[PDB]
Amino acid sequence: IVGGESALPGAWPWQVSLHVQNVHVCGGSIITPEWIVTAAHCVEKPLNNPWHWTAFAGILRQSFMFYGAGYQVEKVISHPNYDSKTKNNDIALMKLQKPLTFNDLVKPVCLPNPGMMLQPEQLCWISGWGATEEKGKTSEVLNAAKVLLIETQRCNSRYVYDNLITPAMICAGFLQGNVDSCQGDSGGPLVTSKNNIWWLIGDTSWGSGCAKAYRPGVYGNVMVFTDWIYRQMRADG
């Protein structure tokens, strides 16, 4: 997050960080208290054995324990039609073995229903634990930023990406720069304000640096993959 500010302890209970080897790697959001939605590029073959993974939720500053007080990931399900070259279909699910009952500052986010009628220049918020300016370290405190959504036609310009954005992904951010996520902000809650309820419609997959001109942020469109998530949840139970 570049150009943002520290996120105050308000009500944003949809950010769970997945830690392996006692170090922060990536984060994501939750929709139901039985699964965790995250990226798929961090679950590659060298990142197998999901038993050695923990989940931290409702934790702003990442210092409250040491190899304990976490949720063990039971099973990880990745998208079958995943390509490592173009980085398409970057959506993965991780099921926890704990019930994770609802408490203070614990509330999931509902999935976007088909037919949201989203505006072209829609305002959204981004958050995550990444660098500060460029090639930095993991942020100790939780920060957030405000971005705008851009159309896919303008994002596919020859001077921006030269038609390298799949229809399953969208573009968001500012063309002038200074507002972008750096390395480490995998996933991240991308919600919007509509009907007094937030809707998760974004999922960070890749990007070309941060705070750079002509390099917007690329997010995953979970609306097309909603039926896949429903099928996986139906087949799991």
Binding site: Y159, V160, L175, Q176, G177, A213, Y214
Partner: peptide, 17 residues
């Protein structure tokens, strides 16, 4: 290679650059 003043200085995507 990405340069500045794209596409044209009249209507550019990043006037600050």
């Amino acid at each position: 290679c990405r340069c500045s003043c794209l596409p044209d200085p009249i209507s550019t995507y990043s006037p600050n650059t």
